[PDB]
């Protein structure tokens with residue numbers, strides 16, 4: 016089905032004719048360039064290696080298919096049929112490429128090499144950057160995992176300040192983004208990246224991806240709870256919202272249940288329906304099976320604060336040991352509308368200023384978590400840094416006059432820890448001097464084989480917060 | 483293999499227990515809610531979803547068991563509706579008892595109108611309508627790409643018509659550079675295909691196969707490209723040999739158009755000294771069908787384009803076209819592919835016009851701005867239940883949140899009509915049945931596991947044309 020010969024940017028089809036004659040090696044690297052988001056979670060390359068790059072990826076039929084498409088697409092014969100046939104005949108269609116990468120889950124400051132790519136056969140000098148397009152899509156799981164982890168840092172800071180511990184942190188940011196991403200494939204990739212940091216998800220696609228490509232000791236990497244949507248409330252008719260609420264919390268009386276409460280009037284629902292008519296069905300619930308009230312409209316901070324004020328007047332509020340107000344354990348709130356890293360910060364800060372514990376609230380995020388992200392957020396970039404031409408290696412780079420931020424690194428690269436425990440990327444082959452301890456890049460792919468793999472449990476450990 | 487039982491939001495697994503008892507019908511609809519203002523949307527992409535995910539035998543015993551096993555662990559509880567899915571398998575050989583009606587693909591519809599509706603065709607499957615919300619709502623993405631691409635085409639058409647008097651070349655003026663900048667291979671194909679509704683130039687090869695498989699064109703392919711350099715093929719020569727790289731590349735591609743990225747070290751030197759002097763003899767000899775296309779790729783986009791054009795206008799023979807705008811010789815063009823989105827595209831063409839440069843001189847490449855920097859909230863894409871039957875009684879249902887009237891949803895059975903003035907209106911509460919507005923513009927496109935109406939990519943392009 017998938018054809019790697021048709022999985023590149025069109026212009027790359029023409030690059031084999033553009034490199035210097037007598038070029039035997041093209042060596043390229045990926046970084047999140049330096050320019051907020053000072054460090055990045057490296058995640059997602061193992062998916063790409065296994066799904067698209069390993070094994071026999073070239074066949075006679077795929078070559079003919081590409082040749083025919085490109086003849087029409089370019090209105091010209093430019094496709095390197097010879098070079099692809101070489102890989103087919105010499106290597107049984109396995110890519111003569113070596114990729115070295117930092118371990119998945121590692122948290123690396125901006126401006127460092129995260130992986131490198133080079134050809135292992137001199138005839139395939141053109142192949143290194145053929146697969147740039149595929150490999151650069153690693154920007155997306157890196158950026159989802161990174162932005163999710165930055166939200167975890169905010170939640171952890173405010174949970175610690177308002178409650179004194181981090182209990183429940185892993186469930187405080189729930190993935191609501193399945194319908195809000197651009198494809199089924201993106202849903203799985205993005206949901207898996209969020210699960211590097213959290214355990215709550217409604218994007219089921221992430222589970223199958225992690226099981227197939229990474230693996231966990233536990234049966235599943237992420238969990239959900241029963242929850243209403245507007246259709247299951249509004250189907251009862253507007254005059255029967257109370258009947259809908261009563262039915263749903265009674266069907267799910269012994270597990271947590273989230274009930275969207277803003278179909279008609281969130282404030283009436285909290286004060287009169289939950290707070291009076293159905294109060295007897297709430298105060299009876301277990302600490303392990305709270306009602307979770309879900310507003311879903313209005314200004315996010317103003318709505319959360321007004322919902323909490325209403326609930327604190329109808330239910331017995333305590334003051335925890337840090338001085339912050341706490342709803343009874345059978346009652347919680349989830350804000351799932353308009354949540355991104357900026358509004359999450361605004362809400363928890365507003366709660367803190369009004370003396371509400373972050374224990375009371377959880378968040379759901381859809382587009383903000385999985386779709387409202389681009390390759391430019393972390394300046395994810397893949398560039399050639401080293402070539403061998405006429406048997407001599409030369410260090411190559413770009414350095415555009417009008418934008419020093421786009422200057423790329425020179426020569427053969429390696430990643431090291433510094434004496435102070437930070438990270439440094441050495442350029443120009445200087446890692447070979449061995450002044451800086453071991454290279455942290457490891458070979459993960461060579462000549463069609465995935466050579467080093469990480470479980471999802473290892474990745475989660477590598478991506479832990481300091482605290 | 484894809485499993486539609488595992489292709490929904492988790493909470494929807496629990497919804498069959500939440501609807502009113504004795505509900506036999508759930509009817510839902512999709513709109514781009516009323517809130518560049520994006521007043522009209524190109525409806526595109528549902529036919530892909532119908533064919534790839536929803537048609538045919540989508541339920542098997544193995545898929546039911548897989549979903550059962552996953553949800554038991556995911557919920558730590560048995561809530562999965564195994565019986566309901568087995569009914570579909572047994573009664574319909576795994577085909578979905580669903581009817582979907584939709585506006586024709588490529589149609590350009592104002593915001594706030596019904597675009598498609600979904601309802602179950604078997605009373606036992608009242609829960610199925612909104613199970614497939616998640617899948618179907620992903621149509622927001624091709625809709626939004628196609629719409630935003632068409633809005634950029636409107637800008638380009640306006641300024642090309644002003645500065646040149648015609649629209650020659652318009653379909654090649656916005657090239658898709660977004661393959662590496664989207665979130666997956668599947669997204670690349672969907673989004674590139676949506677851009678090809680409006681344009682013919684693309685480097686996102688994945689779009690071609692999607693169109694061939696799911697829509698079809700009379701022509702062999704729906705989009706085209708030209709040879710072009712990247713920084714690796716220039717810089718690999720060494721900083722002191724940029725001229726050698728340029729000479730090699732334009733000589734290799736002497737009789738087709740060739741784009742050459744010229745900013746590796748100093749775009750202004752490259753234009754004035756390398757192209758403008760050292761290699762000028764290799765440029766002024768080229769065919770009108772095979773221009774050199776100089777590609778800056780850094781700096782302030784408008785300032786860089788204007789300075790590149792000023793340099794080239796001093797080194798090459800510029801003419802004045804019939805509208806009074808400056809025009810480079812036909813063997814020389816420029817493409818700006820850095821930092822392009824609908825806002826900077828507008829700023830560049832307006833700044834060119836103010837400096838008396840024809841838009842004939844320029845084309846644009848766009849990656850993330852075209853295919854990735856878009857969300858479901860740009861057009862307020864939304865799927866909502868508007869009608870149910872419970873105890874044999876149909877009721878019109880809706881949401882109307884007190885703090886956001888923009889989220890009010892439509893009531894009852896819906897239909898899309900032409901007004902007497904030729905505009906569009908969505909009739910609510912079954913009022914289309916009164917036939918005061920002629921016939922419903924929605925067509926049944928899916929019924930009981932079968933695609934029942936479909937559109938070629940050529941028809942979609944025709945429907946999506948600009949008025950001009």
Ligand SMILES: O=P(O)(O)OC[C@H]1O[C@H](OP(=O)(O)OP(=O)(O)O)[C@H](O)[C@@H]1O
Nearest residue numbers: 191195311351352380381382383863864
């Ligand atoms: O973070 P987001 O990308 O916005 O996703 C989260 C939203 O999505 C759901 O609503 P729904 O599908 O109704 O969205 P809508 O009201 O905009 O149509 C859900 O109830 C949240 O409000």
Ligand SMILES: O=P(O)(O)OC[C@H]1O[C@H](OP(=O)(O)OP(=O)(O)O)[C@H](O)[C@@H]1O
Nearest residue numbers: 396397659663779819820848849850851
């Ligand atoms: O519109 P965009 O999403 O930005 O994609 C277009 C950019 O992508 C390419 O550069 P490259 O891969 O170098 O991007 P980079 O400079 O960030 O590395 C290309 O030369 C354009 O500059």
Ligand SMILES: O=C(O)c1cccnc1
Nearest residue numbers: 191192217242273491493
């Ligand atoms: O579980 C939820 O409340 C949910 C999941 C996805 C989208 N909106 C809400």
Ligand SMILES: O=C(O)c1cccnc1
Nearest residue numbers: 024026659685710741819
């Ligand atoms: O053809 C090009 O110039 C191109 C294609 C994709 C990305 N960047 C540039």
